[PDB]
Design a protein around this ligand. Sequence first.
Ligand SMILES: [Cl-]
Ligand SMILES: [Cl-]
Ligand SMILES: [Cl-]
Ligand SMILES: [Cl-]
Ligand SMILES: [Cl-]
Ligand SMILES: [Cl-]
Ligand code: NI
Ligand code: NI
Lengths: 148, 148
Amino acid sequence: GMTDWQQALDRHVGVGVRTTRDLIRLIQPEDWDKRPISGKRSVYEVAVHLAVLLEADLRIATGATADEMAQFYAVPVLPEQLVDRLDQSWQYYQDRLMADFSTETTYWGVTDSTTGWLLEAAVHLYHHRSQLLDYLNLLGYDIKLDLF
Amino acid sequence: GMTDWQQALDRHVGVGVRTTRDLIRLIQPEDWDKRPISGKRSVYEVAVHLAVLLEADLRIATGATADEMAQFYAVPVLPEQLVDRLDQSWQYYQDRLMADFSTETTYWGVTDSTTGWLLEAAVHLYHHRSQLLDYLNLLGYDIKLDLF
Ligand SMILES: [Cl-]
Ligand SMILES: [Cl-]
Ligand SMILES: [Cl-]
Ligand SMILES: [Cl-]
Ligand SMILES: [Cl-]
Ligand SMILES: [Cl-]
Ligand code: NI
Ligand code: NI
């Protein structure tokens, strides 16, 4: 079973993940290195951050070191593995969601509860899903996907 | 007192609100009617939706009718009242956050728990905060605000 907050997170983070998966599948080959907002991440770089962040944030939450995270971020996610990678991150999140895990103060020093970290990763996901959506719309995709 | 999920929401939605307030205060007079993404809301229209959505969503959640919502959305929020309006919405949210409210199936028919609706309004806030940030960065503001 699960609590009402776990149910809420599973629902809303699952929407986040399924809609992100759909957006990634829209992306055309030509567009991966495009940077619609000069100064910011490319389409592909937004996509990779989205694909890994649900796991990254929870690893950060459980005490991963700066080097451990560098090693984590350095594992390449090629465009064809992005969905597979998102799915893996979503599974990791779901397992933490249901199991009592222990949080620790992060290496750069942010402290939050297990429940707070689970919410942080959720809103971080919606932050970057929005970014990706803005990029694709900047590129003329005119997206008509139900986001809520 | 409050539960661990209420604490998490108060923390993360409060960050959302304070950072949004800061972004709105950056916006220059000339930019309010600009539409950096052709086809989408203007800067001012994103800002107004952000200012009201924490209350709008919870009203929708408690059974507001289509006409009631039309009447709600039609109340004008002038650029100089935007922060005041956001603050009002945040207060409304905080009061619902702490008090057991009853949800009803929406008029267009979405059903969710009280806890799910409180999370929905949170992720909806982060969705549009991201949009506003992308717009201002599209307009050369080069924002250096800590968003998390
Ligand atoms: Cl799934
Ligand atoms: Cl970026
Ligand atoms: Cl981020
Ligand atoms: Cl405040
Ligand atoms: Cl829009
Ligand atoms: Cl929306
Ligand atoms: Ni991020
Ligand atoms: Ni919206």
